[PDB]
Amino acid sequence: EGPDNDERFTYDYYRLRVVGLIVAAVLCVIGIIILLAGK
Amino acid sequence: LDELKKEVSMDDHKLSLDELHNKYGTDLTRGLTNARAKEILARDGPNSLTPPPTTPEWIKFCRQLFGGFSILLWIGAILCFLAYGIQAATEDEPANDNLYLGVVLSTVVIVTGCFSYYQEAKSSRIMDSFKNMVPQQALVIRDGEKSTINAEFVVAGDLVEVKGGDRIPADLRIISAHGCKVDNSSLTGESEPQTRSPEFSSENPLETRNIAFFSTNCVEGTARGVVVYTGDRTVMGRIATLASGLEVGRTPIAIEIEHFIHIITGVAVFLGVSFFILSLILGYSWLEAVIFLIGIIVANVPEGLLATVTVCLTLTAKRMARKNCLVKNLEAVETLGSTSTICSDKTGTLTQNRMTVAHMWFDNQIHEADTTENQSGAAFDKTSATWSALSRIAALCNRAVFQAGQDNVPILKRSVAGDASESALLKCIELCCGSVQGMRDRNPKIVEIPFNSTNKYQLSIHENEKSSESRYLLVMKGAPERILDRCSTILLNGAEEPLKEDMKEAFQNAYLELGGLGERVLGFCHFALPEDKYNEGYPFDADEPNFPTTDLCFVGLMAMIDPPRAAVPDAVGKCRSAGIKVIMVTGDHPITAKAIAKGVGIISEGNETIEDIAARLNIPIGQVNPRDAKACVVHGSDLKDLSTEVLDDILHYHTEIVFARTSPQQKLIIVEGCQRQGAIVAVTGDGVNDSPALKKADIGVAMGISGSDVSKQAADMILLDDNFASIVTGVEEGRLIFDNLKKSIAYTLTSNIPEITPFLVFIIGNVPLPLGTVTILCIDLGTDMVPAISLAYEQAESDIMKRQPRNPKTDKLVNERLISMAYGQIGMIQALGGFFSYFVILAENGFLPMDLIGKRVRWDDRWISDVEDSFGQQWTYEQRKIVEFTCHTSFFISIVVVQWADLIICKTRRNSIFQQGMKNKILIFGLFEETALAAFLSYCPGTDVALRMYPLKPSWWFCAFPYSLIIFLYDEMRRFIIRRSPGGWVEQETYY
Amino acid sequence: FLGRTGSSWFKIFLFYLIFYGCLAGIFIGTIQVLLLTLSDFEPKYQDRVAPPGLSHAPYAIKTEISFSISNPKSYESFVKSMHKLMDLYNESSQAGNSPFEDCSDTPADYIKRGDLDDSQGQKKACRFSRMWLKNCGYAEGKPCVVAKLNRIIGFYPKPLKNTTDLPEELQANYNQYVLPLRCAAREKIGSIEYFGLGGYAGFPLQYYPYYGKRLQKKYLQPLLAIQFTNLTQNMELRIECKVYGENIDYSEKDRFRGRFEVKIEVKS
Ligand SMILES: *[C@@H]1O[C@H](CO)[C@@H](O[C@@H]2O[C@H](CO)[C@@H](O)[C@H](O)[C@H]2NC(C)=O)[C@H](O)[C@H]1NC(C)=O
Ligand SMILES: CC(C)CCC[C@@H](C)[C@H]1CC[C@H]2[C@@H]3CC=C4C[C@@H](O)CC[C@]4(C)[C@H]3CC[C@]12C
Ligand SMILES: *[C@@H]1O[C@H](CO)[C@@H](O)[C@H](O)[C@H]1NC(C)=O
Ligand SMILES: [K+]
Ligand SMILES: [K+]
Ligand SMILES: [K+]
Ligand SMILES: [Mg+2]
């Protein structure tokens, strides 16, 4: 917007962290699954 | 020091009984005086063995703390505390950087110390096992009276008494004996009881009957003797010292480790000081000049590599534990793969160590029995009525019995009370005719004449199990020729017939052939006594010939031997196909040694000794060109008068070598001879007479079930199930781990470049620091760890058992070709991918690449809270630093992303991934966990403080993707060239 | 030689020359495409400069400006940087209707010169006289520090509204058009005096938004002179200058995030 362009200097680092941690966890689980296919 | 002990012993068995007493101030009848014995005790010292001085574990741990990488990491750790000290004095720095980084680095050294300490293990209790062979007490005659004393109180000169069941307390001169037999397997590896008597019977004291040795035991009878040697001075006490004293030495794998440590340490100190001066010339304060150096150290040293090696070794040892192959020393996991020569004991190693029936001669025909443990062969005969007649004599004319409670274990494995030949016959009949006890119940023995030294035969009279007869049957066995002189008829295919010169000659032929096979041959015959001349109550006199022992019916011959283990012939061939030379080294007699050599394939068909040529051509042995003989059989008595140079010529000039009737020191000498030629040597054995050889071997392998305690103490590896096929597996595993270590090392080293280059450009370019010191440790200690380990699970790219053993002088674990690829090619591509993401982060925040050159001065200036970017905006100190640390984070993640491809390319040295596939589940696990770790380290809240890791925007993750892909393509194209032309260019330049 | 023969030494050179040449050419290619995705007038991200920093002219050794009044070369270090900044706000530097403009001598509202486009020439910036900075060689005794708000493209600094309570409660509250700056230390052993545009202790909103170096060169950002004529002497005084606003925030880590950290000591 014009004088109300506050969103330009903002970033949702909170969501990014939530998503990043979700991904890291799921990649960790997936890895266990493939490894445990025989121990 | 031990050169004296490598020599054959000198003795006094040639002296008379009386003469021997003068030498030791002793009485043949009364024995020593209580006072004289105590005097000699203080004089000579105790009848005991002293363990050699060991190196304390303290010094062993700390010796690892100073090996190249640890030295550089120490210089870094201290240089951290240096810069910290210089700070705490000058400008009060409330930070924790240099202090904490110095603590972290010192911990890395200590923990890395534990890993190398675990790898360099030496579990040795040789002298302890020997000490277990000296009895607690001994029986001596002192002041004309026998008393039990502490065996350590035994001295040279006293009168000792032994009987069946006790250990020889010391080396004795036999002066009196009654039916005494002894088990000399300690000195020979052969357990057949040897008679002991006062009479001298051989110039060689290790063969004479009037000497009994410490480390052996009396098996039966009784004997008295004069002590000639005590403690360390006994024949086997010296073997003990020799074995326990032998310098261990460095393994092939250990030598390789130190070698690349020098290389990497070299480049580290090079670039280290090369840029330390390069910085001072650029006008950098010593305050900074050291900070850069610390970074250089951390970049160059692969912090997690030595521990990777250890884990890869451990994991390989775990797989072998699961095939009944125990590894006592982690490094011995690889030595077997580098082995070019095997020196093998015969008895209990190549062989089962059990007299077993091998052949039978009946119906004018040679039949072969199955000698294998698990009986993997086939039948020979069942139909012939002759067989049942021979079978009956083998069961009936036999005094051997199975021990109680064995019905659970297989026939051939069960313990038997009796001599070896009777046990063999027992197990033979029990196997192919069912319960022998049944045959001995159906035919009650009424009278017998046990085998006599003079008679050379054993006879028995039984009540024929037949109801229509129920009469008296005579059976006998003995020396083949003696049995022949007592026969008139031969049971041919059922019916008897006169013994014509024809069948008599066929007997001699059969007899000579079986004997030529190194087999012990016995004759078997029977005689159905006439009914009218022998009533149902007729008494037979065993003392005086009350019955005919002539004109009997010859039934057949039976031959026997201590046979090879089932898997042994095939394992020997497999070792030989892998280009490993196999030598036999045995305490056993030459005829037996040679026969098993041919049986297992040590001596291949057609190959001759000089003696074979001479007999065939009917010419003198001196007339034979010795170069025409590729095979040789050396008796220990001849070995004794040969110099090592002459032993070296024997080793060089023959492909098929048998060393027979060797002493324990002689086995050591043969091993050393092989090593002297530059060969990596394995020893396989099971007896205490293998202990020195096992110790000196680059790798000693002991048998687990049949092995003596001493042998297993001297070994690096134990075959817990006595499965000789495990050697073949071991060499295969050893070769595979050697290749996979290269892959894992290249992988680990490759990521050094993207950690070095940022620090260099930081100096030469004056740009903001692309990657931090902490960030490097997150890679080498964090992300790269599981992937690097996973390479240990790689399958072979080709048939590794088809290639020759590596040349330890030329074929190195880390060579110039590895460095060229890891440092010069792939690592360089990784460095760029790192920098790219760095320029991306900065440029998208307002600092375009052009304006970055020569800005670090203002960038690092803590007091400038208004640096202008390319767009004209002003940044405080902490604001721009957040972007900088975000650059460290994405550079870090870029390494991870480019290591994805590197992990896949390091999978194979030659083959394509499209050929080898992706069947390594640990590797895939590594990829997922590596990425999970990196994401966690970036996105987890609080990690921005502890590690200076900042959250990355999604687009950031993909910066290095095009570089990750170029790596995959590049290496795939390169290896395509290797395969397409075995010529050499790409091969001799980059082929690890 | 060391490794190989001359023929081999050559081939290994011909390879790495072509190899590294290609790699350099590829690296450059990826840099090209990166630049191609970026604007010339505005950076892709601005969340890392977001809350504006407040920086001053006196180059602090360590957020500190200690000196002796009874000594000449004791403050000549801080006068060097003070001069460096103000030397830019010269009238001879601001000449003609291009590219400067005379703007309200009293704090006014924002000025939009269109978009971040080159569809116009150099966007005309408001003039600023260093003569608006009353009282301030500089203050040889009791310094005359000069404040500054960090430039951010398209940033509209918004003052706080007088809805509730305020630190400098309602005094000279030019609510609609001034971004205030109140310095503080309890510990009240000083004498705060502020100088600026229109005589206000703030930043005139008519200098915003900043259009960037590419679209606005020679642009001048508003200054706020602060004088501490403290009646005290020979002691470290921790003085913090704070700016207030809707788009202004602070951090415990970044001690320059919309605030000062000055340790004055007139040890004379
Ligand atoms: C910006 O203004 C300052 C004001 O002090 C100028 O400083 C002048 O320097 C000259 C020569 O050194 C002196 O004779 C004057 O006394 C100073 N003041 C004035 C008001 O003229 C400085 O030169 C100016 N800078 C530029 C680039 O124009
Ligand atoms: C950051 C940049 C400027 C550094 C570049 C370093 C280059 C020149 C280095 C890195 C790795 C190096 C190579 C590594 C391996 C080998 C194989 C060896 O048998 C001869 C030297 C040779 C061929 C090296 C020559 C120089 C080399 C290519
Ligand atoms: C600032 O200077 C003016 C003259 O320009 C003078 O009248 C005034 O006293 C000075 N103010 C202070 C607080 O010293
Ligand atoms: K490293
Ligand atoms: K050994
Ligand atoms: K590394
Ligand atoms: Mg043996």
In a 3-state reduction of DSSP, which class is residue B125? Answer: coil
Q: What is the dihedral of CA C139, C145, C146, C148, to 10 degrees?
A: 170
B345 is catalytic: yes
Written as six digits, the tokens of B153 are 């109180």
Q: Where are the domains of chain B?
A: 1-46+126-245, 63-116+246-339+725-992, 340-352+564-724, 353-563
B33 vs B30, B47, B144, C172, CA distance in Å?
8, 18, 9, 124
Q: Report the alpha-carbon distance of residue C152 to residue B749 in Å, rounded.
A: 44
B839 vs A11, B242, B867, B949, C31, CA distance in Å?
20, 67, 18, 18, 8
Q: Does residue B230 contact residue B154 with C-beta atoms inside 8 Å?
A: yes
Q: Report the alpha-carbon distance of residue C265 to residue C268 in Å, rounded.
A: 9
Active-site entry in B183, B345, B722, B869: B345
B2 is in an annotated binding site: no
B886 vs B298, B841, B844, B866, B953, CA distance in Å?
20, 8, 12, 19, 10
Task: Find the CB nearest A17 among B921, B925, B941.
Answer: B941
* Domains within chain C, CATH numbers bracketed: 1-38 (1.20.5.170), 39-268 (2.60.40.1660)
Q: Report the alpha-carbon distance of residue B842 to residue B768 in Å, rounded.
A: 10
Q: Report the alpha-carbon distance of residue C64 to residue C59 in Å, rounded.
A: 8
Q: Does residue B137 contact residue B145 with C-beta atoms inside 8 Å?
A: no
B520 is in an annotated binding site: yes
Q: Report the alpha-carbon distance of residue B579 to residue B893 in Å, rounded.
A: 46
What DSSP character marks residue C121? S
Q: Where are the domains of chain A?
A: 6-35
Q: Report the alpha-carbon distance of residue B457 to residue B549 in Å, rounded.
A: 11
**Among B481, B476, B396, B479, CA closest to B433:** B396
**Among B585, B668, B671, CA closest to B632:** B585
B516 vs B484, B510, B608, B657, C265, CA distance in Å?
19, 10, 15, 19, 112
Q: Does residue B143 contact residue B33 with C-beta atoms inside 8 Å?
A: yes
Neighbouring-strand partners of residue C41: none
Give the closest-approach CA distance of A15 to chain B in angstroms: 10
B342 — phi, psi (to 5°)? -105, 120
B566 vs B603, B684, C121, C197, C226, CA distance in Å?
17, 16, 96, 104, 100
**Among B615, B550, C9, CA closest to B633:** B615
The label of the residue with tokens 């038997």 reads B416
CB contact under 8 A, A20 and B938: yes
Query: Which subunits sit against C, judged by 3+ Cβ pairs under 8 A?
Result: A, B
**Among B936, B931, B935, CA closest to B899:** B931
CB contact under 8 A, B921 and A38: yes
Task: Find the CB nearest A34 among B924, B941, B952.
Answer: B924
B488 is in an annotated binding site: no
In a 3-state reduction of DSSP, which class is residue B840? Answer: helix
Q: Report the alpha-carbon distance of residue B424 to residue B412 in Å, rounded.
A: 9
Q: In what order do the strands lie in the sheet with B681-685?
A: B325-327, B717-719, B699-703, B681-685, B341-344, B581-585, B656-660, B631-635
B716 is in an annotated binding site: yes
Written as six digits, the tokens of B195 are 């008679």
Using DSSP bridges, classify how beta strands B217-229 and B552-561 pair: parallel, antiparallel or unpaired. unpaired
B353-563 is classed CATH 3.40.1110.10: yes
Domain formed by B63-116+246-339+725-992, architecture: Up-down Bundle (1.20)
Residue B974 burial (10 A CB sphere; 0-12, 13-18, 19+): middle
Q: Does residue B374 contact residue B566 with C-beta atoms inside 8 Å?
A: yes
Written as six digits, the tokens of B132 are 């277990």
Written as six digits, the tokens of B895 are 């390494």
The label of the residue with tokens 């006599």 reads B452
CB contact B30 to A (< 8 Å): no
Residues from chain B contacting residue A15 (CB–CB below 8 Å): none
CB contact under 8 A, C247 and A9: yes
Q: Report the alpha-carbon distance of residue B423 to residue B697 in Å, rounded.
A: 36
- Amino acid occupying residue B922: I
B581 is in an annotated binding site: no
B1-46+126-245 is classed CATH 3.40.50.1100: no
Q: Report the alpha-carbon distance of residue B992 to residue B986 in Å, rounded.
A: 11
- Residues of chain B numbered 926-965 and touching chain A (CB < 8 Å): 927-929, 931-933, 935-936, 938-941, 951-954
Residues from chain A contacting residue B928 (CB–CB below 8 Å): 27-28, 30-31, 34
Nearest CA in chain B to A18: B939
DSSP B12-30: -SSS-HHHHHHHHT--SSS
CB contact under 8 A, C45 and B845: yes
Alpha helices by DSSP H, listed for B578-724, are 590-600, 610-616, 636-639, 644-653, 664-676, 691-696, 709-714
Is the beta carbon of C92 within 6 A of some atom in ligand 1?
yes
Written as six digits, the tokens of B950 are 């900042």
Nearest residue by C-alpha to atom 6 in ligand 2:
B824
> A8, A10, A11, A13: best mutation site toward chain C, by most C Cβ within 10 Å?
A8
In a 3-state reduction of DSSP, which class is residue B645? Answer: helix
CB contact C68 to B (< 8 Å): no
Written as six digits, the tokens of B136 are 């607690």
Q: In what order do the strands lie in the sheet with C146-148?
A: C146-148, C223-228, C192-195
Look at domain B340-352+564-724 and name its CATH class.
alpha beta
Any residues with CB less than 8 A from the CB of B895 and at least 6 apart, and which?
B751, B754, B755, B779, B783, B830, B834
CB contact B984 to C (< 8 Å): no
In a 3-state reduction of DSSP, which class is residue B522? Answer: strand
Is the beta carbon of C122 within 6 A of some atom in ligand 3?
no
Nearest CA in chain C to B838: C31
Q: Would you give the end-to-end CA distance of chain A in angstroms?
A: 57
**Among B527, B226, B499, B221, CA closest to B389:** B527
Cα B291 to ligand 2 centre (Å): 25
DSSP B876-889: -HHHHHHHHHHHHH
- Amino acid occupying residue C204: P
Stated as kind and residue range, the H or E segment containing B368 is strand B365-368
Q: Does residue B173 contact residue B12 with C-beta atoms inside 8 Å?
A: yes
CB contact under 8 A, C45 and A11: yes
Task: Find the CB nearest A6 among C45, C49, C247.
Answer: C247
Nearest residue by C-alpha to atom 27 in ligand 1:
C87
Nearest residue by C-alpha to atom 3 in ligand 1:
C87
The label of the residue with tokens 């403290």 reads C230
CB contact under 8 A, B843 and C34: yes
Residues from chain B contacting residue A20 (CB–CB below 8 Å): 935, 938-939, 951-952
- Amino acid occupying residue B507: F
Chains B, C: CB pairs < 8 Å: 115
Q: At CA B574, angle to CA B571 and CA B579, rounded to 5? A: 130
Experimental method used, please? Answer: X-ray
CA of C229, nearest ligand number = 3
Cα C159 to ligand 3 centre (Å): 29
For residue B161, the Cα-to-chain-centroid distance in whole angstroms is: 40
Q: Report the alpha-carbon distance of residue B119 to residue C26 in Å, rounded.
A: 44
For a mutational test of ligand 2's pocket, the pick from B819, B832, B987, i.e. the residue with the most ligand atoms closer than 8 A to its C-beta, is B819
CB contact B836 to C (< 8 Å): yes
CB contact under 8 A, A5 and C154: yes
Q: How many of the other CB atoms lie within 10 Å of CB of B621?
A: 12
